[PDB]
Amino acid sequence: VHLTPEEKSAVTALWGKVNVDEVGGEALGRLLVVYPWTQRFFESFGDLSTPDAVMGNPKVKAHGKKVLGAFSDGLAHLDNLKGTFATLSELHCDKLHVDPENFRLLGNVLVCVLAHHFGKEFTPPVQAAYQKVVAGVANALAHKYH
Amino acid sequence: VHLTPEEKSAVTALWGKVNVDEVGGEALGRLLVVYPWTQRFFESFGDLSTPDAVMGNPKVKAHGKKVLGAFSDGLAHLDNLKGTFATLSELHCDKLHVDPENFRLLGNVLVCVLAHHFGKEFTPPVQAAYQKVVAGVANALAHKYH
Amino acid sequence: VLSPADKTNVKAAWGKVGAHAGEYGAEALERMFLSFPTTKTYFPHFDLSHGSAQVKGHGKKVADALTNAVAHVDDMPNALSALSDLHAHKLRVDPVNFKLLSHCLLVTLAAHLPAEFTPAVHASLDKFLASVSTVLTSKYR
Amino acid sequence: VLSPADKTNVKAAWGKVGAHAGEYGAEALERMFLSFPTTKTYFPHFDLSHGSAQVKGHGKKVADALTNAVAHVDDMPNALSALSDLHAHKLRVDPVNFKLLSHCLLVTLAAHLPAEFTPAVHASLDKFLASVSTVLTSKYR
Ligand code: HEM
Ligand code: HEM
Ligand code: HEM
Ligand code: HEM
To answer: Which residue of C has its CA nearest to A133?
Structure first.
C-alpha cells in the first residue's frame, strides 16, 4: 500500500497511542463473537460459549497480542508487506486453509476497535488511511493463495 | 499463478478449442443477465431489458471478444499476470472504479460458459485448473487497488 | 432471524443514538465515501466534500430508514419493500456496497457510544444491518 | 423473492435433472473439493478421492435437500430449518463456502444440461441457490 505523508502521519500518531496489551485481545474476542464460524479454529482456547466467556479467556488476550505485533510489523514495512508476511501467509494458507475473506473481517473488526477506543479522534480521514493498511495486510496474508 | 505441467496441459488443450468469437460474448451477456448491477457500466450498449435483448446485442458480442483476448494474454503470460494486466488494472480501478468482486464473478461465469460448451470434457480437474487462472486474472486486474 | 436478545440490543443502542441518528448517518456516509472510493460511483451528482449539505441531507434519509426498520423489526420486508424496489430494482446497487456501509455505520456507532458498543451489542448490530441489507438486495434474489 | 418465472424455471431444470440428482450432487462436491481446497477443512473425516463412497453418499444427501427446497419453494425456511440449525448453529459453516458450492452446482448443471441451461435459467438457478444459502446461514443473522 502507498500511503501519503499525511495518511502515514495519521496512521502513525494513532498507533503509537495504542494499548498493545489489550486492543489485540479485543479484536480477536470480537472476531469470535461476531463471526462465530471463526471459533472453529480456536476450539482449543476453551470456554467460548458466551461473549463474556470469550472476552475473559486468557488465551484469547494472549493470542490477540501476537496478532497486534504482526500488524505493527506491516506498519514498520508498508513498502514490503509481502516479504514481511510470507512466513505468516504460508502458515495461514498452506497449513491452516483460512479463507482470505476472514483476513478482511479481522481487519475490519480491528478498525471498529480503534474507533471504539479513540472515539472522535478516529475521524473519517484517519479511518480511510487505516482501511488501506488493513487491506494491504489482508492482501499480503493471502498471497500464497494468489 | 503456478500451474503444474498437467494443469497447464489441461488448460491449454481446452483453450485451443474455444470459439473465440462467441464464448466471449456469452460470458458478458450472462454476467449482465445474472448480475444486473453490472449493467450500470454498459448502459450505452442499449436495449438490455430482457435476457434475449442482451444476448442478441451486437455490442455485447463485440465487447465480449475484447475480454476473451485479454484472457488469452494472461494464458500466454501466466508468470507475469501483473505486468500483462497493468494497463487494464489502471483502467478498471482508477478510471472506472469497478469493485474487484465483479472480476471474480466474471471469472466464474466464464467457467460456467466453458462447462456449458464442453460438457463432460470439462471435468473437475480441468475446472480446478481454470479456477486458479481465473483467480490469478482477477487478482491481477485488482492490483491497482492493492 | 434476530433472536430476542438481539432485538432488545438493537432497540437499546438505537435508543441511545436518539436525536443524533441523522448526524450519525451523515458521518457514516462520509466514512464510506472516503474509505471506499468505489462507492462514489453511485453518487456522481453529489458534492461529497466534508460539509456537503447533500451528504447531510442524505445521512438523515439513511438514518430515518434505519429507524423505521428498528421500529418494525419483525416486519422489515413490508416496512422497507419500497426501498428494496429502489435499491435492488432501479439503481441496481452492487450488493457488496451494503457491507461497506454497514461496516462504516458500526465504526460511527463505536466512535460515539463507547459504553453501549459491547461485544454482544456489536454482534446484534451486525446481524441487524445484515438483515436490512438482505431485504434491500431482495429483488436480486 | 423468486418471481413466478424463476420458480417455473427452477422446477423445469430440476425436472430434467430427475433421477441424476444424486450423481449430480456427488460431482458438484468433487468440483468444489478440488477447485476450492479451503472447503476440505470441514471434511477431515472423509476420503475425498475421486471414487470415495463417502463423497457419493454425501452428494445424494445434498441433492435430496435441494429437491426438498424445490418441492417446498414457497416455504424454504420451514422446509430447511433443521439443516439451518446444523449448518449455521452447530458445524458453524463459513458463509463464503455456500457461494463456492452453489457455483460448482451451476457448473455441474451446465456440464450436463446444455439445452436447459439458458441465460434465464442460469439466472433463476443462481437466485434459487442464493436463497437456499440465505436460509442455511440464517442463524448467523
Ligand atoms: C488480518 C490477518 C491476521 C493476522 C495478522 C494473523 C497473524 C497471526 C500470528 C502472528 C500468528 C502467530 C503465529 C506464530 O506464533 O508464529 C497466527 C496464528 C493463527 N491464526 Fe492468524 N492472523 C490473522 C488472521 C487469522 C484468521 C482470520 C484466522 C481464522 C479464524 C486465523 C487463525 C489463526 C490460527 C488458529 C492460528 C494458530 C496457528 C498454529 O498455532 O498452528 N488467523 N496468526
Ligand atoms: C475478469 C476481468 C475482466 C477483464 C479480463 C476485462 C477486460 C477488459 C478489456 C480488454 C477492455 C477493453 C479495453 C480496451 O479497449 O482497451 C475492458 C473495458 C471495460 N470493462 Fe472490463 N474486464 C473485466 C471485467 C470487467 C467488469 C467486472 C466490469 C464491470 C461490470 C468491466 C467493465 C468494463 C467497462 C465498462 C469497460 C469500458 C471502458 C471504456 O471503454 O472506457 N470489466 N475490460
Ligand atoms: C443500509 C442500507 C441503506 C439504506 C437504509 C438506504 C436508504 C436510502 C434512502 C432512504 C434513500 C432516499 C429514498 C427516496 O428518495 O425515495 C436512498 C437513496 C439512494 N441510495 Fe441508499 N440506502 C442504503 C444503502 C445504499 C448503498 C449501499 C448505496 C450504494 C452506494 C446506496 C445508493 C443509493 C442511491 C444512489 C440512492 C438514490 C440517491 C440519490 O438520488 O441521491 N444506498 N437510500
Ligand atoms: C447448498 C447447501 C447445502 C446443502 C443443501 C447441504 C446439505 C447437507 C445435508 C443434507 C447434510 C446431512 C444432514 C444430516 O446428517 O442430518 C449435510 C451435512 C454437512 N454439511 Fe452441508 N449442505 C450444504 C452446504 C454446506 C457447505 C457450504 C459446507 C461447507 C463446506 C457444508 C458442510 C457440512 C458438514 C461438515 C456437514 C456434516 C458433514 C458430515 O458429517 O459428513 N454444507 N449438509
So the answer is: C35
